[PDB]
Amino acid sequence: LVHVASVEKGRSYEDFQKVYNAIALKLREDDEYDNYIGYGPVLVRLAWHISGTWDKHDNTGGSYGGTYRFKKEFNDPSNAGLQNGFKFLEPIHKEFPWISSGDLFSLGGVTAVQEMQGPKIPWRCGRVDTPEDTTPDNGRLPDADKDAGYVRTFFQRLNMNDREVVALMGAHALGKTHLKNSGYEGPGGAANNVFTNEFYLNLLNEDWKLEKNDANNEQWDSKSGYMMLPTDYSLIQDPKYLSIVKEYANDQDKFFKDFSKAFEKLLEDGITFPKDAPSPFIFKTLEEQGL
Numbered sequence: 700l701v702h703v704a705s706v707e708k709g710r711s712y713e714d715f716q717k718v719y720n721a722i723a724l725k726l727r728e729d730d731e732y733d734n735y736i737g738y739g740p741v742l743v744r745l746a747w748h749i750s751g752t753w754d755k756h757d758n759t760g761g762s763y764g765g766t767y768r769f770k771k772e773f774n775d776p777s778n779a780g781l782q783n784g785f786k787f788l789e790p791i792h793k794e795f796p797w798i799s800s801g802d803l804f805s806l807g808g809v810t811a812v813q814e815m816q817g818p819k820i821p822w823r824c825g826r827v828d829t830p831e832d833t834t835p836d837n838g839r840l841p842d843a844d845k846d847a848g849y850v851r852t853f854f855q856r857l858n859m860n861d862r863e864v865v866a867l868m869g870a871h872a873l874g875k876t877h878l879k880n881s882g883y884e885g886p887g888g889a890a891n892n893v894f895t896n897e898f899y900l901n902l903l904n905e906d907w908k909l910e911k912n913d914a915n916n917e918q919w920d921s922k923s924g925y926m927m928l929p930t931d932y933s934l935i936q937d938p939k940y941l942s943i944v945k946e947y948a949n950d951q952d953k954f955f956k957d958f959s960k961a962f963e964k965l966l967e968d969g970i971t972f973p974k975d976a977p978s979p980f981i982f983k984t985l986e987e988q989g990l
């Protein structure tokens with residue numbers, strides 16, 4: 700399967716910076732969502748789940764085709780709760796009907812991270828919508844109730860290595876688990892709509908307790924009111940993972956730099972970019988624009 704990036708006709712940096720600003724302006728406006736967390740965390744989760752279907756072996760799945768717009772992927776049990784990120788973006792797609800679905804879902808994730816004061820993420824245009832029959836089947840996204848060997852093995856399919864996996868998981872400092880979506884409940888920290896390295900700090904400094912929640916699932920709970928998933932706590936159980944966790948709890952700039960590279964790579968897996976294709980765009984935030 701080859702998927703070649705095709706820039707939307709005649710579009711350039713300024714067009715996509717207009718779509719960025721539209722998403723970012725609505726993130727500021729619709730602030731009440733999920734008890735004032737706002738839409739940013741569900742939008743970086745949506746960009747991860749449309750990319751996380753990729754399989755390196757046959758180049759199926761991935762962010763290129765925008766296939767989450769089809770019922771099979773929209774109704775995947777693993778995507779429960781992401782309909783709220785879709786409905787947030789649907790106004791903006793009506794306003795810029797020329798951007799492809801893959802591009803709009805991935806730029807929403809980029810915009811949310813930078814607007815929640817994360818690192819800049821280089822983003823590239825050119826994903827092309829593909830037919831309903833290209834939609835990957837349910838079951839390619841990871842279970843939460845498993846251990847470190849499962850996480851390592853699952854992420855080899857998206858060929859991410861240990862460092863990349865640990866840098867990507869730092870995004871679980873954002874938002875929260877919702878019992879009616881996943882059977883898990885609670886936030887992982889106090890700053891859950893500002894991008895920081897707090898996931899790593901909480902993992903190493905809190906007093907975790909294995910408890911059973913109302914959906915009868917086990918999760919790691921702390922006195923402070925935070926929770927960690929079994930696959931999250933996995934990172935301090937494995938010796939290779941645990942020493943990268945310590946590296947990111949001791950250096951927030953290295954965390955930001957490595958997250959930026961692994962999230963771009965995540966979003967680009969499966970796509971062939973021609974050598975005459977434009978460079979990756981670095982978008983300015985509303986704040987850097989005085990907007």
Ligand code: HEM
Binds near residue numbers: 740844878883
């Ligand atoms: C083995 C890996 C992973 C598993 C099992 C997993 C699982 C989960 C689960 C069960 C939730 C709760 C969903 C809900 O109830 O609403 C969640 C939320 C979230 N995850 Fe993951 N995740 C994984 C990796 C990642 C990665 C790599 C990213 C992003 C780079 C990510 C970003 C998020 C975000 C931002 C949320 C919060 C959503 C919200 O607030 O609504 N996840 N994760």
